Design a protein around this ligand. Structure first.
Ligand code: HEM
Ligand code: HEM
Ligand SMILES: Cc1cc(N)nc(COC[C@H]2C[C@H](OCc3cc(C)cc(N)n3)CN2)c1
Ligand SMILES: Cc1cc(N)nc(COC[C@H]2C[C@H](OCc3cc(C)cc(N)n3)CN2)c1
Ligand SMILES: C[C@H](O)[C@H](O)[C@H]1CNc2nc(N)[nH]c(=O)c2N1
Ligand SMILES: C[C@H](O)[C@H](O)[C@H]1CNc2nc(N)[nH]c(=O)c2N1
Ligand SMILES: [Zn+2]
Lengths: 407, 411
């Protein structure tokens, strides 16, 4: 019930008590651990509202005060009457910051309290959503000096009037299936690219085409918009040693901005809540570039380096991997676009864990996601035991809306 | 109940039914996942069900389930338990049991090899000197002049828990570590405490950076005794790099035979507290963890210095760069001396084929992702992208506490 986590590199032991507030379920049982599985009414709503308002009022040292009680009373009256309620601005901001704070898969949470929250609950149309999103993108990008932000569209009502951003991120590259069987551009987005084409998009059919936004207001059929090219900051990828690297013609965008997730605050559901931070280098240079089902560039790079590609034991893949990641970091740094490397990010997260243990009694963390996809054991997170559990407010996966939308 | 796992690179979906036969606990609940926690005297009472389950599995493996031979063996074990409180495995059941403990070991990426295991039955052993002889024979056999063969040696099972056989070493071959008065460590920091026990017990320490530890061996619950493995039986590989000629001058070497000697083998409810087993190395065990962990030999700085990488900012990835070079060197050195070793690409690829085969023929393959994924280049190996289900099957290998914490000294 009071659980210990040990760092095996430093012997530091931390005691977790926060897990006892865990509300949602993990997918694991005493018989089976699902740690590596990617996805494991009025009556319902009032406990959720209360649980949230209690933690909110406690956070501002006003637990058990009239202002606390009064707000419980008010929301209670409002649910009874309307079957939902509206968060105060102060609650919305707190809820959103805490959804990031509770995100067990996020290595970047030392930053959780510096989050700019844009309240878009007055939005009514896809054009309005487009406006709010462009403003988000420009604010967060800040000419390369990136700032964390989330834009929150109106909450779910009857569930037939959902706001959704159909894109998985605000900024991603198209993927095209070709005659010759191969894939041009990002194969992860092939399907979404086709949904764009079939909804009208005129695609340039290149390797790095910024996708248009496909926005759904109020349960209506979604609409297409091109983000002003001028608001999409990109980095050409070169290497500080290898002159030929630039010839590969690689680039990536500066703003990572997840747009397909659902924010839950005090029982309320915000199905459109695009949020953004900045990149850790490996996301681009290890996953985006080197996954076999992504840009899959290792072969071409290793070839340019003239490595012995005959045998897996020459570690040519590993060699090329490092260099590609050196180039990503170098290019963002040279163009002055905020980026963090995995050494620096994981060291920060260990510091954050210690802060959260001291100040909050724990920190939910998902080791499988927190350890970088390269050089795992040479980052301190590898040696750090983590307890994973679900706290609310939260971000949650939600199914892609084309599998749901009634047209 | 059926459970599905998905590979996110290939979209291949597998269906696990094997998990229905698990009963030992995971550490996890519906409310907490303990998947990255390193660690999340039996009565007749509990023993006959454990024996019966085991013999049912053994008898099925041989297509003799429900046979007269199956039934007679159940009746024979049952009587033996009730009259002696324990029982003895037949040789065939010992072999099968040891093989399955390996097969069931969810942290082991090498399991494609599970059915090729040489089992040495040391249950007639009575003294520490006898244990020393068995262990030397196991080292020589497994080593096979560099052409490594997997093996396990199985000493007598636990009886009352006061008569335990234990190998006090964590591995049969490992290097000494010495804490110096100035706070630095000479040799392997992981073995400082065990090294100090060896010295205390009378070992004359050479005090260098790679001194092979003496064996410290407990038979029949007696005080453990020290033995030096004959050096001619300890195969070692000097580490050099195919391109960097100063790499040899770091003075690195490692032993070829990875042989775990501190775990507990459970078969049919019986407990074999000394059961050293050995395979061959995956390169990263040495090049990543042994050499480059901060709490081990910690050579990243010296290697990167010699490489003259930019060391003033982590974002040069000097650590990553030096890490790959060291690992190339380890694989090169082993291959050049004709000592079996596997790289992490080859090992993980084989593990995926093993795991798929297991799903088809066996209905599952319990696997601990946290351990299976190699400690460098994680996502360029196929296991990173493979969903896994972790659960506990018996027969099994289990952690047990270090014996110096529990041993009752005689003097
Ligand atoms: C400030 C810079 C940030 C860095 C460096 C960072 C780092 C990361 C990394 C490396 C991942 C793993 C995701 C992957 O591999 O695809 C991650 C996941 C996640 N992050 Fe953060 N993050 C940052 C900002 C944020 C912000 C501002 C939020 C919310 C407001 C957030 C919420 C999450 C969530 C919900 C996940 C899991 C996404 C999923 O399940 O696919 N991140 N982040
Ligand atoms: C044949 C060559 C083998 C290779 C390349 C192999 C590879 C590995 C690796 C990389 C690990 C993770 C251990 C670590 O990082 O410290 C491991 C763990 C394990 N292996 Fe295998 N293995 C092999 C043979 C065997 C054999 C023969 C057995 C037993 C008969 C075995 C049983 C285990 C067990 C019980 C663990 C967990 C260790 C622990 O929890 O500390 N392995 N092995
Ligand atoms: C906010 C933020 C900052 C930063 N530096 N990086 C990120 C990356 O998160 C992107 C999101 C999109 C992919 O989604 C994978 C995924 C798939 C599925 C089926 C479920 C799930 N939870 N996650 C991986 N994580 C997000
Ligand atoms: C048989 C074999 C072959 C091969 N190539 N590699 C191995 C490696 O297993 C070595 C063993 C020793 C360390 O054990 C650490 C450890 C500590 C604790 C507290 C528990 C636990 N299960 N394991 C890591 N695994 C074993
Ligand atoms: C199957 C496994 O859970 C899956 O590949 C995970 C592993 N760890 C990950 N870690 C991060 N940060 N991002 C990912 O997409 C994944 N994928
Ligand atoms: C705390 C964490 O679980 C611990 O560092 C584990 C992680 N994964 C591992 N994986 C392997 N193969 N070996 C290890 O020692 C570890 N250590
Ligand atoms: Zn679990």
């Amino acid at each position: 019930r009071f659980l210990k986590v040990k760092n095996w590199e430093t012997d530091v032991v931390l005691t977790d008590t926060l897990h006892l507030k865990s509300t949602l379920e993990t997918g694991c049982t005493e018989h089976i651990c699902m740690g590596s599985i990617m996805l494991p009414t009025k009556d319902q709503l009032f406990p959720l509202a209360k649980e949230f308002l209690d933690q909110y009022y406690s956070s501002i040292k006003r637990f058990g005060s009239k202002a606390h009680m009064d707000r419980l009373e008010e929301v209670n009256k409002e649910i009874e009457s309307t079957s939902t309620y509206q968060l105060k601005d102060t609650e919305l901001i707190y809820g959103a910051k805490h959804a990031w704070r509770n995100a067990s898969r996020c290595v970047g949470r030392i930053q959780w309290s510096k989050l700019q929250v844009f309240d878009a609950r007055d939005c009514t149309t896809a054009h309005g959503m487009f406006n709010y999103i462009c403003n988000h993108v420009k604010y967060a990008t800040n000419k390369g000096n990136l700032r964390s932000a989330i834009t929150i569209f109106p909450q779910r009502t009857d569930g037939k009037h959902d706001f959704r951003v159909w894109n998985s991120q605000l900024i991603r590259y198209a993927g095209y299936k070709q005659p010759d069987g191969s894939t041009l551009g990002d194969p992860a987005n092939v399907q979404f690219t086709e949904i764009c084409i079939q909804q009208g998009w005129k695609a340039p059919r290149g390797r790095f085409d910024v996708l248009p936004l496909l926005l759904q207001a109020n349960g209506n059929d979604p609409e297409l918009f091109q983000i002003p090219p001028e608001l999409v900051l990109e980095v050409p990828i070169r290497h500080p040693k290898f002159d030929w690297f630039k010839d590969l013609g690689l680039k990536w965008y500066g703003l990572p901005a997840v747009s397909n997730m659902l924010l839950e605050i005090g029982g309320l559901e915000f199905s459109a809540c695009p949020f953004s931070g900045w990149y850790m280098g490996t996301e681009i240079g290890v996953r985006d570039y080197c996954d076999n089902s992504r840009y899959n560039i290792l072969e071409e790079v290793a070839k340019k380096m003239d490595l012995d590609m005959r045998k897996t034991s020459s570690l040519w893949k590993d060699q090329a991997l490092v260099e590609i990641n050196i180039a990503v970091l170098y290019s963002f740094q040279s163009d002055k676009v905020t980026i963090v490397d995995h050494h620096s990010a994981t060291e920060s997260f260990i510091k954050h864990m210690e802060n959260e243990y001291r100040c909050r009694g724990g920190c939910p963390a998902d080791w499988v996601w927190i350890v970088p996809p390269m050089s795992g054991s040479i980052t301190p997170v590898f040696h750090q035991e983590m307890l994973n559990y679900r706290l609310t407010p939260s971000f949650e996966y939600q199914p892609d809306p084309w599998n749901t939308h009634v047209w």
